[PDB]
Design a protein around this ligand. Structure first.
Ligand SMILES: COCCOc1cc(Cl)ccc1[C@H](C)NC(=O)[C@@H]1C[C@@H](O)CN1C(=O)[C@@H](c1cc(C)no1)C(C)C
Lengths: 145, 104, 90
């Protein structure tokens, strides 16, 4: 259900990374399979050639933490007016304090050692349930209908 | 520009924001609304330095660069008990424990 | 603004806007019931001060086009801040 439309209509795009993260752009191919593209360093831009009706999402390259693009989850290139490229502004969301703490603990503790931390067992399961594009595509398909 | 502050006395910490262009006196009116002590019974400090009523928070060094929502700048507060002002006293927060081995 | 007082396990009093404290569904329940003070027997001042900075950060940056900076957490407090965030549902 979440897949690029095969328009073959070129759409020029600027990926603008306004986050402090290394960004992984992900293209949803015509089968709905996520295809990773080369990463963007923090505060950098990249001109890319895409197509009308193509679906993109953006993650932290290292952790797969979710990022926003134009303040939403999915970016669809549209018609270029007067040859002007479409801006994809990639930003940190406001993470919950809990999700932000899980990010910092995952950054400090090898996953073999989660079980050694002095916390309730439900929090081990929250650490172990890493952000993952495949999980989010499952969530997003149910929210679509 | 909004500046984001912690106004601190003893074991009291107020989180509030104010304009860079607003005055030390106007910040004492904020503190009055909350702690019910008039401006003339208040001294405000940046670190150990007494701030002048008529100065802007910007002129006292509270700027958007230094006084951020997620890292607010500290204003010291001292009260006049009757005749004279207590010394500026700010109780430190508790100490975190040692990093566990597995986080080193 | 209505303010509320949040008191840490070591007796530090944090006075924050009520609207900011209501970021926590747990705090909303403790203030409304089924008072303008809440005591946290389990949250020390080095953790509760950070929770209040999070409230300020969240209200400032929610629904904002202005580029959002990272909420910083020191390694030393991450574990206790995680347990507080989990209880407070924020
Ligand atoms: C290849 O060698 C140069 C480096 O290729 C890169 C590198 C970066 Cl970082 C970005 C874009 C590109 C290239 C030019 N474009 C892309 O891959 C664009 C971005 C998406 O819309 C999918 N896509 C496609 O071409 C598809 C396509 C073709 C047609 C027709 N309809 O769909 C795919 C079949 C690959």
């Amino acid at each position: 259900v979440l897949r690029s439309v095969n328009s073959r209509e070129p759409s020029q795009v600027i990926f603008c990374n306004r986050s402090p993260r290394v960004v992984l752009p992900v293209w949803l191919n015509f089968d709905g399979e996520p295809q990773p593209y080369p990463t963007l360093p923090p505060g950098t831009g990249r001109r890319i050639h895409s197509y009308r009706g193509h679906l993109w999402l953006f993650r932290d390259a290292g952790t797969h933490d979710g990022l926003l693009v134009n303040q939403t989850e999915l970016f669809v290139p549209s018609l270029n007016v007067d040859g002007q490229p479409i801006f994809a502004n990639i930003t940190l969301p406001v993470y919950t304090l809990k999700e932000r703490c899980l990010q910092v603990v995952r950054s400090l503790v090898k996953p073999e050692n989660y079980r050694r931390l002095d916390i309730v067992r439900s929090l081990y399961e929250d650490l172990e349930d890493h952000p993952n594009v495949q999980k989010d595509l499952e969530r997003l398909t149910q929210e679509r209908i | 520009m909004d500046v984001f502050l912690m106004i601190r006395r003893h074991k009291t910490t107020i989180f509030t924001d104010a304009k860079e262009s607003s005055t030390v006196f106007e910040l004492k009116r904020i503190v009055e609304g909350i702690l019910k002590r008039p401006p003339d019974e208040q001294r405000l400090y940046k670190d150990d330095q007494l701030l002048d009523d008529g100065k802007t928070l910007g002129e006292c060094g509270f700027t958007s660069q230094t006084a951020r929502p997620q890292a607010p700048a500290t204003v010291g507060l001292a009260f006049r008990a009757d005749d004279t002002f207590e010394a500026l006293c700010i109780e430190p927060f508790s100490s975190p424990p040692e990093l566990p081995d597995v986080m080193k | 603004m209505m303010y509320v007082k949040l008191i840490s396990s070591d007796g530090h009093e944090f006075i924050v806007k009520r609207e900011h404290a209501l970021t926590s569904g747990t705090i909303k329940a403790m203030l409304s019931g089924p008072t303008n003070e809440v005591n946290f027997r389990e949250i020390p001042s080095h953790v509760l001060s950070k929770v209040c900075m999070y409230f300020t950060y969240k209200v400032r940056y929610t629904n904002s086009s202005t580029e959002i900076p990272e909420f910083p957490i020191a390694p030393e407090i991450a574990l206790e801040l995680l347990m507080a965030a989990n209880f407070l549902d924020c």
